[PDB]
A paper describes a structure:
DNA polymerase (DNAP) can correct errors in DNA during replication by proofreading, a process critical for cell viability. Here, we present an ensemble of nine high-resolution structures representing human mitochondrial DNA polymerase Gamma, Polγ, captured during consecutive proofreading steps. The exonuclease (exo) site is located ~35 Å away from the polymerase (pol) site, with no direct path between them.
Alignment of the Polγ_B homodimers in Structures II and III reveals the next step of proofreading (Mismatch Locking complex, Structure III), where forward translocation of Polγ by one base pair along the DNA axis is observed. The first unpaired template base (n + 1) is flipped out and partially stacks the mismatched base, assuming a “locking” conformation. The stacking interaction of the locking base with the mismatched base of the primer may prevent the premature fraying of the latter and its separation from the DNA template, ensuring timely entry to the exonuclease channel.
Author numbering:
A (entry chain A): 79 to 249, 259 to 320, 336 to 497, 524 to 623, 740 to 996, 1049 to 1228
B (entry chain B): 64 to 160, 170 to 355, 362 to 485
C (entry chain C): 66 to 355, 368 to 485
RNA sequence: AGACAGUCUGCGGCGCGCGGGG
DNA sequence: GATCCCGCGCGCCGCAGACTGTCT
């Protein structure tokens, strides 16, 4: 009870609130907001949790992480201090796996019977995606794998059962195995047993993940480091005056990492690039050289790992971090045959849309050529500045007759005509002037039509796009005024001829936009401004409407069809599928069941946030984009389903609880956690659209304001946002805080400097960022060692204060993963496989154990939040938090159980259920299989 | 007016439609028009060929079938609308002594060719080894009853003829809806092809009075939206109706189970499609261009190129075009046998004439063609003339048509 | 005869039940439609006729003729295949009777409603006026059309009142307007061309023959029969009808239906050429058959050219190659039977016999050796010779074979 | 007369803005 | 926010490499 807090199953009353703390908290709440705001008490549920080891909720997680990560730590230690023999003289040219014994002796082996390995794979990018060769090193010997495709014959593109085999048969000690590698996810993607639906007792370590964990750098840091490494060396540009981090930071590439962590000679880089831009034939010719290069890369990675492991353990002392990284290194995504179909449709539709965009434009070109005949370029106000190609290549039988005989005509005319054509006019026979009269009124219309030496000049102008600067003035007044003038003297449309939007009568030359300091670009306006903005016109047909809309429809798929439609997808055979998938409803269909490994870096950026360009991105199935239906078509096979959820406002809650803990021991101390907990749109004081109406444009259009402010956005950003809102003047906008910074630091020192005060407690984040000691935030993981102010002092504050919250979120994710693994291990919940997108988490689980796993993610969330609040806080927690709002069960993956799409236009037909989120209906059971 | 008025002009004049002083949109839509001109016949033939290539070619398990225009008289329940008349006028019953007054037990002209496909289903089931998923396609003429619903001078119902292309697809019941969506997607994709304004072709969903779903395709003529093609999920009702004896004969193998197939009927009216494409090909806000031209797609334009001989050394030396004509005739390039008008006509009227017939290119052979052979090649899309090559004309035209076929 | 109608009933050349089609009723149109193979063979024959007669002639244009006559002012004397021609309820010949006021000349059912066409000549005669403007008053020119016609059958034992069963015949018609002068020359020219065209695809052209005949109204005529095994059955007719048929229509006015020839106005003389495409198909099917049972249809007339199949090897990794080859062949315009997706391997000998009965030029077999070195087994229908060919050369070889067969 | 200006073509770098996601 | 990307066309150059007249 109390302030809507849950029942304290674990813990005692050793902690006391503090009367002075209570008085200060209620005084602050009265000062900012209302002290008395009763809220409906939520229902209280009690369930028998599993027995928690240790005490104080920290020993429990420590023991779980240690138990999970002991075998892999043992394997890493085995690889840490194990010397290796020299590389063999000559690599063996044979199919399969070969082990190199002493003095280079090579012996054929089924698979490496080793606990630990440093592994690297090469793939012939020119043809297919099957692996070509691989080199690995164990503590005692070298191993080399040569693919079956060294022989000459045709091979399928299915890519199943082809890649390397690395997991021994389970049915002779320490079954756990660890594989180390730089970008090891790429190498894991090329292992046979990693595509099974059932889990396996093998884990992968990424040296790049550790490098980002220790001695990592941010994106701006990456740019500065690259510039400094270059021979030579934006907007505000306040300088740095602190470049010590250059000597400790590096780029994620293997060469730079080896140089930073090892002082040996630089690794030689092969300039041939036979794997990237070479056929399989040169690979056969250059077998020894390529094997040597791969072995060099493996050796460098091993040296890097040796130098990194103790440093990483020192800077991430908590075993939970390692356990969570190991768990997050194994992701799974069943696809089934529909994925292929999707790759067709999203492609075909895209092409179709492009055609609809292209053809209309072609017509607009063709009808313009007729302007040449009349010699009336002055008549057209759009094409009179155009080239107009003034130049040219300059290169009665009154008889019945009838009734012919059976004789045949001599013909023989075509041969003579061809002879006269080819032999004479020697000049033209070489380099023919294809343009002749074609160029016409459009500016060098010949250019739009392919050169055709390789193309053959496809009908009409096929090199015509929407952003050539020729498309304006071809659709009348589409862009700004009559002249576009992408070069200097541009259209003064801004973002009657000067400053006034839209060029007319050619009043003044050169740049005269003087609205946003630039007016050169055209269109590129999210708000169409073609209904009331005016300055948009055309002759009719694919003009105005049906013009920008296709562009926005295919924009996403345009620069996505390369990353997508090329993911390494492996289709398992019938014998490989488990018992559950077979002898089940659905199934059959002569369909292909397969999987895609996301190839995710466990820690790809500052913090340890995972990075994946195709899978770990916030994108929903918007009903306007062709490829929007990504993250779907990941339906589980028959007998399996995806169970999981998102953790609500993770970042806001983390910041709120940190501020509350810093201010006092309660959860509503600073009038910000109270607003996050006891704030509702209908009644409570919600952070968004309430308590901020006095600032900005009413309640709406205030989410981004506060989001940026708690993410580090400064006052000038808010001033810029307000200036374009309601066209308020700069004087009208408050240069100082005034209405702004009411939540954040308004009084600065405020007498009595450092200190935030006001509604939001930035003191904790600032103190952590500027600590100068290894940060070790909640759950204790140090900073990347390159953004520190100790011995560096780079004043990159925007980066570290955000790093605090983001690394806290990653710690939350690690805790969730370890708790889920422990729950699945203790109780026989099949389907340990997991997927994660920042806060969002999903698990592939059997239908039989679907509800047991649905019950899970609730004890996990409760324990994770109770462990978060335990650090620098008391055990009691708000009832509203510590439990998920809903748990999705749908077979596919989507933002919400209820769905929608664009390309299919009827996706429910293709065997799509609903998703039945549970909410509170799942809290009527124990987590024992015995129980119901 | 120019809105559906000038389109009818330069249509009978250039022999795309039969000339009978009709100029009636309702007659054309219903099917009471006298017929189509040779250009119209060629355009319809090209459209039918494209439909055949897209539907039954490049599509295994789809086979041709022929349905008779008539069916046997016996066992013909129902009657014609005007055959059922028993109100009055029984004055003369003087006739002394099949025949009768109720349907006469006689044959009928088919209104749709789905019945023939359903009949041939059992026979055609053997060539697929009873693989339930398979189709039967056919293009043929169907007869329908149409009347002006005004006055009695028309008397008996008029009979209209429409060239319809129909595909009957037998699919397992479980996959019926998805297969129907696929077909609806492929038909909408095909009709938007060859179209200068694909937006004018639209689709909608409809429900049968028994609850069976289906789709309708429409083209937006200037007066309004007119139906062109219809997709219906027959739901194995008529198939069971015609075969009441036993269900074993109707069992086809889907996956590894024997099931009764579900019938999907996709029937489009080719004449209306031809009219829609003709309307689409034809085109006032600061235009000042005029230049009437039928910008039909190259794949289905009735005539590809036009030959002519102008100001040569003599009319006897025209034979250079002869043979070249034949050279174009090889590999199936349709060419207008020009170079025989022998009338002194201004080249602008001549070019406008060929533009109105929708000919992609105009080839003119001059006196300078016997030596360093170059032929003036004018393009329909843009009024610019090229010299190009006599030897490469065949290859250039083949390439143009092939590229038009694929984007 | 026996052993031929059974083979055609099987393999889906002639659609129908056993003894339904029979040897009789195939010459007449009162039989069930053709099978898919028969339909494809008919389409090939029609395409070849169109190529030889219409598009290469440079003066023959297509014409659109409706299946039914309008009905008003219908003359009371005619064949009257279907006196109704209305939607449903064809009253057939309706000879005699109709003596009462009901179903009299007043309104429909008395040579008043309309009739189904029995020949394509009338449509061409109707369109002649506009087709003159099409060719710009150039007198010598033709109009061609392939279409279905309906005829009445009789005899067939005693049925009491005759059933006048409707027989559908797919006929190709050419109406050639030529100056009345040198009309016999054009008659002989067309007769020779048609006889050559019919003999072109025949294995034994001696069976195809021509005979001459005289008419009281028409000047002269010719007939082609092909000499079926039981006897000679008329398959094509050529008639020099004369101008009186054309003069009968447009009875009023003069100097409107005449055309210019040698700069001299003259009323044209019409030649009617009418060939039975269905009977031609049946004749060609009989010609091809002949000690294995094989239908040696001409390469330009065979419905299916090549057949794909899989022999041994993995079930997968060959279906993909077969699909690729299938797609390439269709992209190149070659019809192929997708036998690769067949599930019972059955027998090689039985498979070859089945494809021989279907008149497939070549049999293509893809095995694991194809994956090894890209070699496929190729069997020729004509000479039953088996060879090995690279998979990348099959398309070119087939196109070359078809082109060589097309030429003399 | 033979040798050298152009035009074109290939191909390389760097500015300019614009759009998905961090 | 955060500064930062990749897939376009413009452009604006550059330098080789080829072909065509062009100059002495």
């Amino acid at each position: 009870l109390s302030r809507g807090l849950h029942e304290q199953i674990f813990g005692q009353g050793g902690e006391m609130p503090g009367e002075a703390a209570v008085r200060r908290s209620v005084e602050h709440l009265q000062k900012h907001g209302l002290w008395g705001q009763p809220a409906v008490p939520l229902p209280d549920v009690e369930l028998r949790l599993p027995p928690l080891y240790g005490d104080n909720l920290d020993q429990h997680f420590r023991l779980l992480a240690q138990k999970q990560s002991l075998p892999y730590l043992e394997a890493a230690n085995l690889l840490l201090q194990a010397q290796l023999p020299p590389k063999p003289p000559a690599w063996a040219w044979a199919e399969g796996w070969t082990r190199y014994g002493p003095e280079g002796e090579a012996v054929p082996v089924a698979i490496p019977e080793e606990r630990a390995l440093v592994f690297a794979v090469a793939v012939c990018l020119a043809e297919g995606t099957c692996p070509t060769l691989a080199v690995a090193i164990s503590p005692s010997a070298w191993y080399s794998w040569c693919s079956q495709r060294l022989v000459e014959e045709r091979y399928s593109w299915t890519s199943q059962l082809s890649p390397a085999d690395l997991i021994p048969l389970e049915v002779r000690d320490w079954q756990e195995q660890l594989v180390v590698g730089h970008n090891v996810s790429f190498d894991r993607a090329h292992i046979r047993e990693q595509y099974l639906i059932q889990g396996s007792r093998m884990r992968f370590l990424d040296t790049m993940s550790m490098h980002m964990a220790i001695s990592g750098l941010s994106s701006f840091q990456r740019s500065l480091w690259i510039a400094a490494k270059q021979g030579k060396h934006a907007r505000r540009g306040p300088a740095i005056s602190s470049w010590d981090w250059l000597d400790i930071s590096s780029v994620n590439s293997l060469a730079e990492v080896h140089r930073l962590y090892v002082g040996g000679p630089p690794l030689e880089k092969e300039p041939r690039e036979l794997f990237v831009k070479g056929t399989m034939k040169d690979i056969r010719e250059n077998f020894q050289d390529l094997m040597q290069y791969c072995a060099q890369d493996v050796w460098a990675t091993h040296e890097v790992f040796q130098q990194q492991l103790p440093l990483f353990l020192e800077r991430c002392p908590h075993p939970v971090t390692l356990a969570g990284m190991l768990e997050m290194g194994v992701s799974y995504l069943p696809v089934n045959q529909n994925w292929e179909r999707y790759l067709a449709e999203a492609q075909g539709t895209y092409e179709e849309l492009q055609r609809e965009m292209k053809k209309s434009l072609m017509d607009l070109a063709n009808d313009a050529c007729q302007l040449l005949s009349g010699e009336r370029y002055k008549e057209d106000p759009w094409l009179w500045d155009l080239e107009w190609d003034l130049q040219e290549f300059k290169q009665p039988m009154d008889q019945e007759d009838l009734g012919p005989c059976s004789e045949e005509e001599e013909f023989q005319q075509d041969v003579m005509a061809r002879a006269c054509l080819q032999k004479l006019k020697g000049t033209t026979e070489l380099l023919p002037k294809r343009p002749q009269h074609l160029p016409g009124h459009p500016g060098w219309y010949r250019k739009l039509c392919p050169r055709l030496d390789d193309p053959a000049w496809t009908p009409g102008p096929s090199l015509l796009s929407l952003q050539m600067r020729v498309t304006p003035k071809l659709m009348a007044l589409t862009w700004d005024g009559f002249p576009l003038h992408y070069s200097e003297r541009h259209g003064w449309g801004y973002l009657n001829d000067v400053d006034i939007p839209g060029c007319w009568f050619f009043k003044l030359p050169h740049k005269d936009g003087n609205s946003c300091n630039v007016g050169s670009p055209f269109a590129k306006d999210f708000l169409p401004k073609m209904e009331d903005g005016t300055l948009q016109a055309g002759p009719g047909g694919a003009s105005g409407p049906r013009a920008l809309e296709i562009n926005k429809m295919i924009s996403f798929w345009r620069n996505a069809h390369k990353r997508i439609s090329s993911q390494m997808v492996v289709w398992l055979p019938r014998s490989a599928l488990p018992r559950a998938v077979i002898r089940h409803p659905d199934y059959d269909e002569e369909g292909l069941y397969g999987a895609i490994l996301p190839q995710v870096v466990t820690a790809g950026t500052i913090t340890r946030r995972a990075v994946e360009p195709t899978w770990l991105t916030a994108s929903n199935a918007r009903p306007d984009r062709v490829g929007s239906e990504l993250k779907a078509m990941v339906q589980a096979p028959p007998g399996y389903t995806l169970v999981g959820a998102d953790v609500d406002s993770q970042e806001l809650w983390i910041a709120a609880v940190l501020g509350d803990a810093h201010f006092a021991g309660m959860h509503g101390c600073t009038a910000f956690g109270w607003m996050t907990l006891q704030g509702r749109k209908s009644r409570g004081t919600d952070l968004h659209s309430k308590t901020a109406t006095t600032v900005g444009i009413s309640r709406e259009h205030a989410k981004i304001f506060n989001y940026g402010r708690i993410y580090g956005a400064g006052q000038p950003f808010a001033e810029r946002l307000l200036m374009q809102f309601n066209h308020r003047l700069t004087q009208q906008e408050a240069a100082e805080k005034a209405q702004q910074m009411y939540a954040a630091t308004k009084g600065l020192r405020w007498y009595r400097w450092k200190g935030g005060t006001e509604s939001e407690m930035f003191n904790k984040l600032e103190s952590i960022a500027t600590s100068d000691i290894p940060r070790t935030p909640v759950l204790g993981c140090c900073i990347s060692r390159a953004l520190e102010p100790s011995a560096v002092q780079e004043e990159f504050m925007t980066s570290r204060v955000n790093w605090v919250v983001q690394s806290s979120a990653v710690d939350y994710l690690h805790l969730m993963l370890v708790a889920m693994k422990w729950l699945f291990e203790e109780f026989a919940i099949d389907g340990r496989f997991c997927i994660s997108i920042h806060d969002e988490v999903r698990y592939l689980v059997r239908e039989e154990d679907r509800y047991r796993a649905a019950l899970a993610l609730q004890i996990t969330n409760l324990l994770t939040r109770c462990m978060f609040a335990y650090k620098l806080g008391l055990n009691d927690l708000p009832q509203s938090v510590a439990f998920f709002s809903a748990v999705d069960i749908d077979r596919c993956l989507r933002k919400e159980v209820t769905m929608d799409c664009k390309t299919p236009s009827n996706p429910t037909g293709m065997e799509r259920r609903y998703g039945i989120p549970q909410g509170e209906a799942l809290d009527i059971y124990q987590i024992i299989e015995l129980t119901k | 007016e120019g809105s559906e008025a000038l389109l009818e002009i330069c249509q009978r004049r250039h022999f795309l439609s039969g000339s009978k002083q009709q100029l009636s949109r309702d007659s054309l839509l219903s099917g009471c028009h006298p017929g189509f001109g040779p250009l119209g016949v060629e355009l319809r033939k090209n459209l039918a060929a494209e439909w055949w290539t897209s539907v039954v070619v490049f599509r295994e398990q789809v086979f041709p079938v022929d349905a008779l225009h008539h069916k046997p008289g016996p066992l013909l329940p129902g009657d014609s609308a005007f055959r059922l008349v028993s109100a009055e006028t029984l004055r003369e019953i003087l006739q002394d002594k099949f025949l009768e007054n109720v349907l006469k037990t006689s044959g009928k002209l088919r209104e749709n060719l789905l019945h023939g496909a359903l009949e041939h289903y059992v026979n055609c089931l053997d060539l697929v080894n009873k693989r339930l998923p398979y189709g039967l396609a056919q293009i043929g003429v169907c007869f329908h009853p149409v009347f002006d619903t005004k006055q009695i001078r028309n008397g008996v119902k008029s009979i209209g003829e429409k060239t319809e292309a129909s595909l009957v697809w037998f699919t397992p019941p479980r996959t019926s809806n998805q297969w129907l969506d696929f077909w609806l997607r492929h038909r909408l994709q095909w009709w938007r092809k060859f179209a200068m304004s694909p937006s004018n072709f639209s689709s909608s969903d409809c429900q049968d009075e028994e609850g069976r779903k289906g789709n309708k395709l429409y083209y937006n003529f200037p007066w309004g939206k007119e139906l062109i093609e219809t997709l219906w999920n027959l739901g194995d009702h008529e198939l069971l109706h015609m075969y009441p004896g036993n269900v074993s004969k109707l069992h086809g193998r889907d996956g590894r189970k024997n099931v009764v197939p579900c019938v999907l009927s996709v029937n489009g009216d080719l004449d209306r499609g031809m009219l829609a494409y003709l309307y689409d090909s034809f085109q006032t806000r600061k235009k000042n261009l005029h230049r009437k031209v039928l910008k039909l797609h190259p794949c289905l334009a009735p005539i590809k190129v036009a030959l002519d001989v102008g100001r040569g050394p003599t009319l006897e030396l025209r034979q250079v075009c002869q043979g070249l004509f034949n050279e174009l005739l090889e590999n199936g390039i349709s060419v207008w046998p020009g170079y025989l008008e022998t009338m002194q006509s201004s080249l602008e009227q001549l070019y406008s004439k060929y533009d109105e017939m929708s000919i992609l290119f105009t080839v003119l052979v001059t006196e300078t063609t016997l030596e360093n052979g170059l032929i003036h090649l004018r393009s329909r899309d843009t009024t610019m003339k090229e010299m190009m090559h006599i030897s490469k004309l065949k290859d250039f035209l083949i390439k143009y048509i092939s590229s038009a076929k694929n984007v």
